[PDB]
Design an enzyme around this catalytic site. Structure first.
Site, PDB file in Angstrom:
ATOM      1  N   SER A  96       0.817  -1.223   0.000  1.00 19.92           N
ATOM      2  CA  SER A  96       0.000   0.000   0.000  1.00 19.92           C
ATOM      3  C   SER A  96       0.844   1.263   0.000  1.00 19.92           C
ATOM      4  CB  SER A  96      -0.909   0.030   1.229  1.00 19.92           C
ATOM      5  OG  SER A  96      -1.566  -1.209   1.414  1.00 19.92           O
ATOM      6  N   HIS A 100       3.503   8.940   6.523  1.00 21.75           N
ATOM      7  CA  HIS A 100       3.733   8.987   7.961  1.00 21.75           C
ATOM      8  C   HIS A 100       3.516  10.421   8.404  1.00 21.75           C
ATOM      9  CE1 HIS A 100       5.501   5.040   7.680  1.00 21.75           C
ATOM     10  NE2 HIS A 100       6.557   5.461   7.003  1.00 21.75           N
ATOM     11  N   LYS A 133       8.031   8.990  13.497  1.00 22.35           N
ATOM     12  CA  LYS A 133       9.117   8.048  13.409  1.00 22.35           C
ATOM     13  C   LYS A 133       9.681   8.016  11.980  1.00 22.35           C
ATOM     14  N   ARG A 275      -2.920   5.452   4.926  1.00 18.01           N
ATOM     15  CA  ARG A 275      -2.896   4.757   3.659  1.00 18.01           C
ATOM     16  C   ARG A 275      -3.378   5.682   2.577  1.00 18.01           C
ATOM     17  NH1 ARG A 275      -6.087   2.342   5.923  1.00 18.01           N
ATOM     18  NH2 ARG A 275      -5.520   1.151   7.813  1.00 18.01           N
TER      19      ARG A 275
HETATM   20 ZN   LIG Z   1       6.694   3.985   5.482  1.00 19.68          ZN
END
Ligand SMILES: [Zn+2]
Length: 392
Positions: A96, A100, A133, A275
């Protein structure tokens, strides 16, 4: 023991390669399960393990009893745990498209999901950390991927053949700016019924009269997501092929995808994922859009540029969380030292690791853990040793 051969988890997600890890590393797979990821670390859902001296114990559990000695004082005081998960990914299928979220929006998302009482390990769960992250991908075999938005004129040139697929495309072509790129993105993602099939049919016609890239990548993807608006993404996002040895650092608010191949990935144990296509799961489009930076990234800026010092090839990362380096082995020993815990992974060749009287052999695909209070170790052999650690 000074050095610790790791017993590592293999996640058998459906999208994994039945063969890669066996081919590369001679990892056994008699039942011919798909092997998606090899995990090297101390994740609470499937930690690596070490052997007492002759029973097996969780590496996560072992760190927890000996935090400062195993992590170093720096890491123990900054994170309070092993601040990285190290992976071998085997994409036998395209995965997918993902974004982030940045720091601010991660806190909010993390808090929103926590307020609603969603367990941390539910499918519903998109935010597992209040922080943003970082993520480094490093190609072990040729590795196909998307990363970031292309240059506007490049996007224009790619959309022209499919100008008739959706008015949002026509809109963009007229005035190809950040704002209309945003509307185009959301519009593709939200297409419904005959609007969607109309756009797909235009794209399919195009595949029959366009050659090379990224048409070819769309053709590949379409074998797995034939009814996905994400098929339009290689026209918007940079299609990259990493050669073995090349790496990409994945910024916040930047759509990316892993499409094919084997790679090392360094990350946190816990991350946040929105997503953006190539998925059957429902997407909250306004939220996604709110978390995307609609800003081109020129091709020349995709790969992180390593820095070579002696036998050390460092891949500099703008984060304190973890660091990544590759070490050329020679038959004469060199010293591998760090101020933190480190995971050593033989990429190719073979590593002999020495600590005083202790010595340990890693054949390709094998890894050891070195606690902070055990640095340095001496390494010799042929090929390459990969190290994840912490520079602090
Ligand atoms: Zn990633």
């Amino acid at each position: 023991a000074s050095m610790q051969k790791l017993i590592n988890s293999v996640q058998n997600y459906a999208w994994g390669s039945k063969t890669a890890l066996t081919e590369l590393y001679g990892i056994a797979n008699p039942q011919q399960q798909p092997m998606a990821e090899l995990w090297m670390g101390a994740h609470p859902k499937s930690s690596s393990r070490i052997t007492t001296a002759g029973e097996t114990v969780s590496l996560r559990d072992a760190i927890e009893k000996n935090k400062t000695a195993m992590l170093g004082e720096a890491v123990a005081n900054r994170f309070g745990e092993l601040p990285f998960l190290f992976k071998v990914l085997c994409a036998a299928q395209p995965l997918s498209i993902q974004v982030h979220p940045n720091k601010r929006n991660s806190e909010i998302g993390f808090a929103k999901e926590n307020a609603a009482g969603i367990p941390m390990d539910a499918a519903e769960r998109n935010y597992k950390d209040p922080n943003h992250k970082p993520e480094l991908v490093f190609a072990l075999t040729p590795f196909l991927a998307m990363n970031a938005f292309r240059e506007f004129s490049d996007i224009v040139s790619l959309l022209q053949p499919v100008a008739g697929a959706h008015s949002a495309i026509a809109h963009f072509l007229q005035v190809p700016n950040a704002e209309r790129l945003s509307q185009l993105f959301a519009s593709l993602l939200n297409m419904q019924g005959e609007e969607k099939s109309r756009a797909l049919a235009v794209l399919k016609a195009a595949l029959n009269s366009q050659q090379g890239e990224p048409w070819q990548t769309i053709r590949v993807i379409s074998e797995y997501y034939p009814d996905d608006s994400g098929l339009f993404s290689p026209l918007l996002l940079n299609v990259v092929k990493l050669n073995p040895g090349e790496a990409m650092f994945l910024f916040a608010e930047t759509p990316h995808a892993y499409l094919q191949g084997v790679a090392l990935e360094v990350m946190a144990n816990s991350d946040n994922v929105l997503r953006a296509g190539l998925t059957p799961k429902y997407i909250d489009i306004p939220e996604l859009v709110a978390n995307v930076k609609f800003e081109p990234k020129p091709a020349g800026e995709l790969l992180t540029a390593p820095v070579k010092s002696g036998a050390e090839l460092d891949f500099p990362i703008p984060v304190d969380d973890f660091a990544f380096s590759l070490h050329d082995l020679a038959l004469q020993e060199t010293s591998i030292g760090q101020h933190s815990a480190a995971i050593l992974f033989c990429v190719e060749g073979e590593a002999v690791l020495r600590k005083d009287e202790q010595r340990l052999v890693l054949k390709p695909g094998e890894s050891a853990f070195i606690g902070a209070d055990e640095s340095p170790v001496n390494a010799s052999g042929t090929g390459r040793l990969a190290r994840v650690y912490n520079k602090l």
